[PDB]
Amino acid sequence: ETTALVCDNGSGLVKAGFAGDDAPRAVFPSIVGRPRHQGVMVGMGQKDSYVGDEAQSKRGILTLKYPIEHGIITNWDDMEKIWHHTFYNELRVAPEEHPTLLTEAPLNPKANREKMTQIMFETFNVPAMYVAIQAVLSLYASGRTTGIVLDSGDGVTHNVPIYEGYALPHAIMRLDLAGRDLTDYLMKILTERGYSFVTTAEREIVRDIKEKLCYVALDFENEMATAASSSSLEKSYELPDGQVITIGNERFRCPETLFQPSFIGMESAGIHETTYNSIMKCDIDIRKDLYANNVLSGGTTMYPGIADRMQKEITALAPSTMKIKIIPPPERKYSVWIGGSILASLSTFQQMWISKQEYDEAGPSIVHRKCF
Amino acid sequence: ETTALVCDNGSGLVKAGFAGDDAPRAVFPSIVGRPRHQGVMVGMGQKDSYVGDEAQSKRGILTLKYPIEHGIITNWDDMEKIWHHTFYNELRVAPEEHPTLLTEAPLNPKANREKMTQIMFETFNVPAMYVAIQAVLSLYASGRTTGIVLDSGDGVTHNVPIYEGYALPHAIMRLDLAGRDLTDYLMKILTERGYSFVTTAEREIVRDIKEKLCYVALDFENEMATAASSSSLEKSYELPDGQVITIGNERFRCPETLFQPSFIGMESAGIHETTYNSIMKCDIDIRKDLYANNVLSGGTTMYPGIADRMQKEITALAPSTMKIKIIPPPERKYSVWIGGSILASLSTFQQMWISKQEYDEAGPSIVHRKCF
Amino acid sequence: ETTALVCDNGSGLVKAGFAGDDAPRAVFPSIVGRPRHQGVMVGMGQKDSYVGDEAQSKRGILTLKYPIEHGIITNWDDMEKIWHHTFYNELRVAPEEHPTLLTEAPLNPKANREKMTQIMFETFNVPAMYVAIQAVLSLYASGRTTGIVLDSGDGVTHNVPIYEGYALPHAIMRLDLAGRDLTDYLMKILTERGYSFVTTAEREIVRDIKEKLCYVALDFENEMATAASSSSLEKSYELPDGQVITIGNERFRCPETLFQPSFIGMESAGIHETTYNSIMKCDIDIRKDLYANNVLSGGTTMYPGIADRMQKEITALAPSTMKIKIIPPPERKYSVWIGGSILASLSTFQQMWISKQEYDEAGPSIVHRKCF
Ligand SMILES: Nc1ncnc2c1ncn2[C@@H]1O[C@H](COP(=O)(O)OP(=O)(O)O)[C@@H](O)[C@H]1O
Ligand SMILES: Nc1ncnc2c1ncn2[C@@H]1O[C@H](COP(=O)(O)OP(=O)(O)O)[C@@H](O)[C@H]1O
Ligand SMILES: Nc1ncnc2c1ncn2[C@@H]1O[C@H](COP(=O)(O)OP(=O)(O)O)[C@@H](O)[C@H]1O
Ligand SMILES: [Mg+2]
Ligand SMILES: [Mg+2]
Ligand SMILES: [Mg+2]
């Protein structure tokens, strides 16, 4: 009868739907807005706070505030609000009937899972739930059983090396360089040309510019030398009001930070080094099989030409007597949700849900003992 | 109708097959491994422990453990498991019909044979069984009937002098220096160059390096002096992950342990002295015939140039007026199994099986009174 | 006239001083720091690299990097720099006059000692030098002459059984678990509570937390059970900027990796097992004395209550009819240097130095022929 409810709870977007499908049904930004002006107009259905896609449409008035920051939820009051919205106004189902499946980034605060389970068992009264790691669901979706995954969302970037089904918990690195940092860096470096973006609403415009105009350069120095005699690199974008801007070497300087994290003045290894370091933390016999299965998930890994530079850069580190392959699917943006649907549809998994009667016995602490 | 089922269940490898052939059918390592990680997957065909050549392919996960140590069985529970594997998954033959011939090392604990007979007669319900010594079977395979044999496997090294059909049980020396100590010594002296191997998985890599890169030097001092100006001795080996290691005078230092057991910190005489002492313990009238028949069996004796040094070394001890010949058959690695096949094929031997109804009357104590 | 210079150059700190004393004069962390920022300020005496305590004072800017890792020296250029620092800027003596006494861990790559000899005989032009083992020097300072020493520093942990003046080279175990691994594990498990430390500058902060706030539990299960109803276990530590942090059952979980190394997911026996296995590798006639003389040295062995658990754990392994004693001195942190001073002060030891004229004839290879 009832099957599941699979909702990937990212930092940027709330991707959600039913189990067993090939694509999520609801995809909206995870923001909640609150008005900040006089509001002298009468009627017109003025609500206290606009959440989801409606907030993005009217951003010129409200002050957007993301409830999820760096993967850790910090505004639980708004979080239950956005969950209520996605369950009622977007799917139009009763959450009390269908079990739900959730996702969380690894090495996360321990209280976060407890409070998530408590909220989903008290306010919504679901029958069952389960918390999964995104990096294993991506490899679920990819269809293989062994490999190393480089997830890269909006707030957190991490690796999980997994052999033929056996995870290695001591090789799970996690760096806090993600999409929001790139957006901030682009906003900062656009000032050199003359354009200044400050308001929370203009952060969305800068994010859109990054989404629709940025690419990863295969060779940074040669690209800079070419941009010195700037002929065919500059592009044009149209602001909502009508002004046209031109960005040149900012096109490939912004996404490079993933490879040279010193551009934001933080001493860390780029995404091409954390993968290699996480591979080198496993015992020697499996590095050959890990090298040949590199899976890219997450939205931030969707820049053009990222895979080519990842190959060209990792090949410089690994020994020369072996091959390296990266496996970017064209539909990686919903890889976590696809994997969650695949896991929820399985028959063997039906015994791993957390029953309500089980939770009443042991309290919210059951999540650590049962889920992982 | 039925002929036999002989399996040279040594310490290192389990060599098994049918009588009357010229080579065994199943040759696999005698290791049983158990995983050590949580296994976040689902399904994928889990066994609690992988036995035989399957475990050797997944050593990146498990903690391999040899059930047989120094010839003496220590972990019967896995011993019956690997015997079950041998009978079913590799030979595909019903043990309830074919009689089996087992082998053991001399000067072994009394309880070992008793437990072996009890397990074979209760768990597998064989009709007949018999336990023989490796050193006589290797001579049997060699085809002669008078000579002294130096067996050297993975856990035990021993000598058994045989005159014309008559053994000499009062002159059977046995030193516990074997291949495993050589592997550990190579692991220890490889740290001098810089490479450190610790886990059970890397012991296999070190063992393979020993197998395909070590040799026995005729004159140790001259070889060291040559290695002082190291030009044409060093070789290269490629590790599973890609790194290449170079080992120089570590090549001939490892297998010299058999000749100077003081390298591994034990007060004992080498294999070039135990054979001589065993020969000198027999009466004077057979030493001339024993000196001319030296049969080398077992895997450990497969180093290049071992026979030549053995000859040059025993010649120095024996009187100068008589000759020495060390017969090193080419296939000696399977000599014990060949001899077991020859012994089980013969018609005369068919009266010395231990019938099940005979075992019922007297219990498992029949093995000592009947086998030897 | 001239007496000696004992410079115990361990992995974590460089403890140095003169012979004949009861405590070293120089104790500073063994790091070298390099700036990474704009440096727009003029003057102020900005140096290229800060070495020693000065770097530890300005960690907010520099990128600290240890030149010695796991006892093996990897950055010789920085190592000679810190040697020049300790010789000139702290002791204020001319190295060309006084002889120096160095120390190193056993089972180290051969090239380390040779390069140490070359550096000390070419760059500084010392008259004579000698290299010792920490484990024997700690027993030397302890005052006895028969016992088993468990040295456990910052990079290496090794055991050396000693009978009445005769060392047993075939029973020197060595596991690579030390204080740095504990610091990394504490950094990783602090993220469960919510505190994230990534910067190399914050590793020092975590190390200070570990030094001043953690202890070894006698019974792990009972301590966890009491921590379930956490009342009197949490303690408060103040960060340099002003925030306070509170850790509960994290106080005793970090030092429990010494005894259960499976927490870092590496396959080795705990320090209570390597000592016992090293005892069991010796001949049967010295174990009774080895049991009753257990000497602990090194900084890592200074956790409160380590001796009680070590005794309770070794008693459970040894035969029940013979007694176990552990001898932790109150000042065991400097025991290696105290032993070095004692050894260099003696008159009989005067004939074992490596003379410069002797080194010229034979080159840097003399260390292996003379020292050990
Ligand atoms: N075409 C694109 N180019 C660059 N970045 C993109 C693009 N599309 C999405 N992104 C980035 O991906 C992120 C959204 O991914 P998301 O679905 O939130 O994954 P997760 O839910 O795991 O965080 C956004 O932060 C955005 O910056
Ligand atoms: N080519 C080789 N070079 C050196 N040693 C070898 C070689 N082949 C096998 N060995 C050694 O021989 C041993 C295998 O002998 P094995 O068949 O187990 O004798 P048994 O069955 O009597 O124990 C292994 O432990 C290995 O160390
Ligand atoms: N009070 C303490 N509690 C716990 N650990 C300590 C304490 N004091 C020092 N240590 C540890 O001791 C180590 C320093 O020992 P060290 O003098 O470097 O030995 P060695 O010089 O032989 O390496 C450091 O890694 C530190 O973690
Ligand atoms: Mg995602
Ligand atoms: Mg053999
Ligand atoms: Mg120390």
Curated annotation (Swiss-Prot), chains A, B, C:
Oxidation of Met-41 and Met-44 by MICALs (MICAL1, MICAL2 or MICAL3) to form methionine sulfoxide promotes actin filament depolymerization. MICAL1 and MICAL2 produce the (R)-S-oxide form. The (R)-S-oxide form is reverted by MSRB1 and MSRB2, which promotes actin repolymerization. Monomethylation at Lys-81 (K86me1) regulates actin-myosin interaction and actomyosin-dependent processes. Demethylation by ALKBH4 is required for maintaining actomyosin dynamics supporting normal cleavage furrow ingression during cytokinesis and cell migration. It is found in: Cytoplasm, Cytoskeleton. GO terms for cellular component: actin cytoskeleton; actin filament; blood microparticle; cell body; cytoplasm; cytosol; extracellular exosome; extracellular space. GO terms for molecular function: ATP binding; hydrolase activity; microfilament motor activity; myosin binding. The modification N6-methyllysine is found at K81. There is a cross-link at E267 (Isoglutamyl lysine isopeptide (Glu-Lys) (interchain with K-52)). Keywords: Acetylation, ATP-binding, Atrial septal defect, Cardiomyopathy, Cytoplasm, Cytoskeleton, Disease variant, Hydrolase, Isopeptide bond, Methylation, Muscle protein, Nucleotide-binding, Oxidation. There is a cross-link at K47 (Isoglutamyl lysine isopeptide (Lys-Glu) (interchain with E-272)). The modification Tele-methylhistidine is found at H70. Its EC number is 3.6.4.-. The modification Methionine (R)-sulfoxide is found at M41, M44. PROSITE patterns: ACTINS_1, ACTINS_2, ACTINS_ACT_LIKE. The keyword ATP-binding applies. GO terms for biological process: actin filament organization; actin filament-based movement; actin-myosin filament sliding; actomyosin structure organization; cardiac muscle contraction; cardiac muscle tissue morphogenesis; cardiac myofibril assembly; heart contraction. InterPro entries: Actin, Actin/actin-like_CS, Actin_CS, ATPase_NBD. The keyword Ribonucleoprotein does not apply. It catalyses: ATP + H2O = ADP + phosphate + H(+). In vertebrates 3 main groups of actin isoforms, alpha, beta and gamma have been identified. The alpha actins are found in muscle tissues and are a major constituent of the contractile apparatus. The beta and gamma actins coexist in most cell types as components of the cytoskeleton and as mediators of internal cell motility. It is linked to Cardiomyopathy, dilated, 1R: A disorder characterized by ventricular dilation and impaired systolic function, resulting in congestive heart failure and arrhythmia. Patients are at risk of premature death. Actins are highly conserved proteins that are involved in various types of cell motility and are ubiquitously expressed in all eukaryotic cells. Polymerization of globular actin (G-actin) leads to a structural filament (F-actin) in the form of a two-stranded helix. Each actin can bind to 4 others. Belongs to the actin family. This is Actin, alpha cardiac muscle 1. It comes from Homo sapiens (Human). The gene is ACTC1.
